[PDB]
């Protein structure tokens, strides 16, 4: 795998090794909420983190990761459009290079300053490797960042940053609480959609919170500190890894509010 964010890796390359790049329910989409239309059959999302384990934080050359006991039903997700039962694997964000850009969805074109992805699978499936390979296998819970007031959430993320500089690099990270970053409204819009990065597989139902998060500005000047590069390798800053909106094809966003 040599794809990435750069002029000659990133997203108008990655359909060449990847030609689901071009498919009908690709990830991610902006978002018009004026398009969108309210679906009071939509449950309230249920979110159950309060038995959460973290384990460890990895930067993987393209994001960093911070990882959860999956083994159990810990850290769940269901309600919302799922049926069943999704748990919790991971988080991850996307960000940029300013503050203007970052987000992977967009709001009325709008590009936030980071995104927010807390990954899930279908436990229906039995491991996250055949989960992927189903139309209903995972539930992404996308989250909006925005630079104002910091996220004390966060803050255990931002600290633990220097010590997973470069990718390959990983740190323990137990006993992090992920409900620390989670805005106060669960409203949210939903769509059928895939992965945001190879293997791009269309395998995901998106849940976008519509309440961004606040974080503040040295925050996420930490995230762009990373690098992609490996130890000993010049310096590349991790930014921009996001994708841009691709089309939305024949597909309806809903919302679960009005
Ligand atoms: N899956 S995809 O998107 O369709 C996709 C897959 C491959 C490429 C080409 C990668 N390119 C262009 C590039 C991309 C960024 C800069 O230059 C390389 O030059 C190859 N080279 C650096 C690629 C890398 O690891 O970044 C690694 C091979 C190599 C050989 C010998 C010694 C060391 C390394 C582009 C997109
Ligand atoms: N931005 S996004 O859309 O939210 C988003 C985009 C990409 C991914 C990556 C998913 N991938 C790659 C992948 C794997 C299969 C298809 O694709 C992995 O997690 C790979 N992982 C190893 C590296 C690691 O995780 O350390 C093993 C996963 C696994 C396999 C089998 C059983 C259990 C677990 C997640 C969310
Ligand atoms: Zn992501």
């Known amino acids: 795998h040599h794809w990435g964010y750069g002029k000659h890796n990133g997203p108008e390359h990655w359909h060449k090794d990847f030609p689901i790049a ?4 690709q990830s991610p989409v902006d978002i018009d909420t004026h398009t969108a239309k309210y679906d009071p059959s939509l449950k309230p999302l249920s979110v159950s983190y309060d038995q959460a384990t973290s384990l460890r934080i990895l ?3 393209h994001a960093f990761n911070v990882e959860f006991d999956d083994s159990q039903d810990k850290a ?10 999704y748990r919790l694997i991971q988080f991850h964000f996307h960000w940029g290079s300013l503050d203007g850009q970052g987000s992977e969805h967009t709001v009325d074109k709008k590009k936030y300053a980071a995104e927010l992805h807390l990954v899930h699978w279908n436990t229906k499936y039995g491991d996250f490797g055949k989960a992927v390979q189903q139309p209903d296998g995972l539930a992404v819970l996308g989250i909006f960042l925005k630079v104002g007031s910091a996220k004390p959430g966060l803050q ?11 990718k390959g690099k990983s740190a323990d990270f137990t006993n992090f609480d992920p409900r620390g970053l989670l805005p106060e409204s669960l409203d949210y819009w939903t769509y059928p959609g895939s992965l945001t ?3 791009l597989l269309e395998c995901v139902t998106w849940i976008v919170l519509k309440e961004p998060i606040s974080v503040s500005s040295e925050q996420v000047l930490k995230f762009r500190k990373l690098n992609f590069n490996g130890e000993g390798e010049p310096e590349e800053l991790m930014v921009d890894n996001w994708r841009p909106a691709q089309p939305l094809k024949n597909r309806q966003i809903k919302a679960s509010f009005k």
């Open 156 to 166: 255990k993320v931002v600290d633990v940053l220097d010590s997973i500089k470069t």
């Open 59 to 61: 930067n993987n050359g």
């Open 22 to 25: 071009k498919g009908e329910r």
């Open 76 to 85: 769940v997700l269901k309600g919302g459009p799922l049926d069943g039962t």
């Open 197 to 199: 990065t190879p293997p």
